[PDB]
Design an enzyme around this catalytic site. Structure first.
Site, mmCIF file in Angstrom:
data_model
loop_
_atom_site.group_PDB
_atom_site.id
_atom_site.type_symbol
_atom_site.label_atom_id
_atom_site.label_comp_id
_atom_site.label_asym_id
_atom_site.label_seq_id
_atom_site.Cartn_x
_atom_site.Cartn_y
_atom_site.Cartn_z
ATOM 1 C CB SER A 5 -30.206 55.414 -21.503
ATOM 2 O OG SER A 5 -29.508 54.456 -19.829
ATOM 3 C CD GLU A 54 -35.186 42.374 -16.258
ATOM 4 O OE1 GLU A 54 -35.564 43.571 -15.738
ATOM 5 O OE2 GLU A 54 -34.696 42.284 -15.092
ATOM 6 C CB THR A 87 -25.966 59.049 -23.648
ATOM 7 O OG1 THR A 87 -26.644 60.001 -22.504
ATOM 8 C CG2 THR A 87 -26.027 60.540 -24.363
ATOM 9 C CB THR A 103 -23.858 53.488 -21.562
ATOM 10 O OG1 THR A 103 -23.766 55.225 -22.126
ATOM 11 C CG2 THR A 103 -23.024 53.180 -22.248
HETATM 12 C C1 LIG Z 1 -28.634 53.819 -19.923
HETATM 13 O O1 LIG Z 1 -27.795 53.367 -20.707
HETATM 14 N N1 LIG Z 1 -28.286 53.408 -18.786
HETATM 15 C C2 LIG Z 1 -28.252 53.745 -17.704
HETATM 16 C C3 LIG Z 1 -27.159 54.861 -17.160
HETATM 17 N N2 LIG Z 1 -26.550 55.611 -17.996
HETATM 18 O O2 LIG Z 1 -26.954 56.685 -18.631
HETATM 19 S S1 LIG Z 1 -26.287 56.741 -20.601
HETATM 20 O O3 LIG Z 1 -25.459 56.237 -20.281
HETATM 21 O O4 LIG Z 1 -27.053 56.382 -21.382
HETATM 22 O O5 LIG Z 1 -26.630 58.352 -19.568
HETATM 23 C C4 LIG Z 1 -26.467 53.870 -16.720
HETATM 24 C C5 LIG Z 1 -26.155 52.585 -18.193
HETATM 25 C C6 LIG Z 1 -27.259 52.416 -18.607
HETATM 26 C C7 LIG Z 1 -27.702 50.982 -17.942
HETATM 27 N N3 LIG Z 1 -27.173 49.544 -17.838
HETATM 28 O O6 LIG Z 1 -28.878 51.570 -18.099
#
Ligand SMILES: *C(=O)N1C[C@H](NOS(=O)(=O)O)CC[C@H]1C(N)=O
EC number: 3.5.2.6
Length: 270
Positions: A47, A145, A212, A214
């Site tokens: 993200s 993806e 962030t 994840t």
């Molecule tokens: C980004 O990595 N995502 C968006 C969401 N949480 O973002 S964060 O963790 O960076 O704040 C869900 C997880 C993830 C995704 N799988 O898109």
């Protein structure tokens, strides 16, 4: 090199306890001193690309004065998993600026895809990054993806160093015009998803903006931030992680711990 890693920090022990790899680049913008560990290795953006996405939208808005106020309507088919803000405005639409804030501050995935479309897709965001001098960043795919985080796959990756360098250009340097720069900073300061990452290593009386990421697989997660200690120049830093196995878990605590070591390495009393 003379001002890089003046003070060694136990990053290797930290990543060995985590069971993976940690990449760190931190810049003291006053002196130019840096902390650097695996800083030129590639890590998945996950993200975290959404911060640069919002910056690219702001750059476009410098030539298109009506862009940020433009109302965007979208169908239910746009609402991919993790769209906590855009799902509440499905029946109303949201402005480009609101989508940008949601992508940055809530990591909203539908918002990110809608803004990517505005910029001409992953290649359009990559082109913006090239235009500010970042030759490392690449976005290749859309949500979701782009989160696959496959070991050795360079798609949708950057390096901690390039992330930090580009973040510095956009938040403190001259890559954005002054009003847009402050809007980008304000969006990052308002992030809601990073309280357990770099922010956890930063004293509460310092200002901080972050984004962030994840990915959800391969122990892959990250954070980058601009930090304004009181009484000294700002610090820009990036902490990225990955791990060898698909089901390895990410750790927020490891990201916070790596940020603490980076600040210690810069001699920033925190
Ligand atoms: C980004 O990595 N995502 C968006 C969401 N949480 O973002 S964060 O963790 O960076 O704040 C869900 C997880 C993830 C995704 N799988 O898109």
């Amino acid at each position: 090199h003379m001002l890089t890693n003046l003070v060694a920090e136990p990053f290797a022990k930290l990543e060995q306890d985590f069971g993976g790899s940690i990449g760190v680049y931190a810049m003291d913008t006053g002196s130019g001193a840096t902390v650097s560990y695996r800083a030129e290795e590639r890590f998945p953006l996950c993200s975290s690309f959404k911060g640069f996405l919002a910056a690219a939208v702001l750059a476009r808005s410098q030539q298109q004065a009506d862009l940020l106020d433009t109302p965007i309507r979208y169908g239910k088919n746009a609402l991919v998993p993790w769209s906590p803000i855009s799902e509440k405005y499905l029946t109303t639409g949201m402005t480009v600026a609101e989508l940008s804030a949601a992508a940055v501050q809530y990591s909203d995935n539908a918002a990110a895809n809608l803004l990517l479309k505005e910029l001409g897709g992953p290649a359009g965001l990559t082109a913006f990054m090239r235009s500010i001098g970042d030759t490392t960043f690449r976005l290749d795919r859309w949500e979701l993806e782009l989160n696959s985080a496959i070991p050795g796959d360079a798609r949708d990756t950057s390096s901690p160093r390039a992330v930090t360098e580009s973040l510095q250009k956009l938040t403190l340097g001259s890559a954005l015009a002054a009003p847009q720069r402050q809007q980008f900073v304000d969006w990052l300061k308002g992030n809601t998803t990073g309280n357990h990452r770099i922010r956890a290593a930063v004293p509460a009386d310092w200002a901080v903006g972050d984004k962030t990421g994840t990915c959800g697989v391969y122990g892959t997660a990250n954070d980058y931030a601009v930090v304004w200690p009181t009484g000294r120049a700002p610090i820009v830093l990036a902490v990225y992680t990955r791990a060898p196995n698909k089901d390895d878990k990410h750790s927020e605590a490891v990201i916070a711990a790596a940020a603490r070591l980076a600040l210690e390495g810069l001699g920033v009393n925190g």
